[PDB]
Amino acid sequence: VRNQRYPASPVQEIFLPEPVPFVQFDQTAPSPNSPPAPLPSPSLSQCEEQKDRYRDISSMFHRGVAGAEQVREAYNSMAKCFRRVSVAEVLESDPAFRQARNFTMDLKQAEDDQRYKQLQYGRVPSILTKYHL
């Protein structure tokens, strides 16, 4: 059942060993030098077919011919639609995110910064502080 990484293993592994992947981003495409545009702010205008479909499927599960997977899916879509507006309200209101919304920076500054020097993990205190010595 396994799909081998090296079907020609005594040849492929030595000649062309697979590398360690990179999951932060694709790395095969250009880097955007502009952020994403602010999406249109949402509201409860758009939960129509989610509210009514969840009502339908819940009434049908109350009958029993529906199932539970469907109820979970519908409820989670509806709740996502509500969470959109709740998150929009939080972002627009709470002032700590105003800087983050209008956050801008370029790769040149990212490469010129020097905060990477201070990224070392600290050191756990001594176990004698438990006995206060």
Binding site: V1, R2, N3, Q4, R5, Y6, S9, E13, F61, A68, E69, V71, R72, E73, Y75, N76, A79, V124, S126, I127, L128
Partner: protein, 226 residues
């Protein structure tokens, strides 16, 4: 009112927690598929190991009735073992869920008697394997305690190493197998103890003169040793 709506994102978004779940639920998000861990490696019973035992590769006998189907270690593993973490390595020598040889005692005095005769410890019988994180936490706490006990000790890291090897070999559930791995570090600690005592208390001996054939050949160098 449905139970657990927001609690199965693994189901809503087809996210497998492991390749076995991926294969089962047919999410097919693991590029390399899945080689199933067979049942003899997922569970089983403790066995005898030495070739100088007559009941070798036979299940260990207990006072209580126990399934005699044994855990089989991986003796012929595949070449590519994509996950070489401790999680996937430990399954080759122990079952993660522990052995299937645990008792359910009908009485408390049976438990007492088994313990009294050395045939039961819950530490050993009702327990899983330890995770790498747990092992590391234990080792680091022990190392801190030893460093506090004495910094100016030469056998320090040797004691830490025997502790580390016991933890890695899962001595809670296979103590005899783990001691077989760790007695070398115990022996090295035993040596370091005397080497320190003889350095603290000055102990030396009259060395004899150099032998006539200390060098095998005249053109050979006689590298000086302390």
């Amino acid at each position: 009112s449905i139970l657990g709506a927001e609690a199965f994102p693994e189901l809503l978004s087809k996210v497998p927690l492991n390749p076995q779940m991926d294969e089962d639920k047919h999410f097919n998000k693991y590029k390399w598929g899945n080689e199933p861990i067979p049942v003899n490696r997922r569970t089983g019973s403790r066995m005898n190991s030495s070739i100088y035992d007559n009941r070798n590769h036979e299940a260990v006998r207990h006072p209580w009735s126990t399934d005699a189907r044994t855990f089989h270690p991986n003796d012929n593993p595949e070449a590519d073992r994509i996950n070489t973490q401790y999680s996937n390595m430990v399954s080759d020598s122990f079952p993660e869920g522990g052995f299937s040889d645990a008792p359910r005692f009908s009485s408390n005095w049976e438990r007492l008697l088994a313990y009294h005769h050395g045939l039961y410890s819950p530490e050993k019988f009702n327990s899983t394997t330890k995770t790498a994180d747990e092992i590391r936490l234990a080792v680091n706490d022990f190392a801190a305690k030893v460093h506090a006990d004495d910094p100016k000790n030469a056998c320090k890291y040797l004691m830490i190493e025997e502790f580390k090897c016991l933890q890695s070999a899962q001595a809670r559930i296979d103590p005899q197998g783990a001691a077989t791995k760790c007695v070398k570090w115990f022996n090295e600690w035993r040596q370091c103890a005397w080497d320190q005592e003889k350095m603290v208390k000055g102990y030396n001996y009259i060395e004899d003169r150099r032998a006539r054939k200390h060098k095998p050949y005249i053109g050979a160098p006689d590298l000086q040793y302390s």
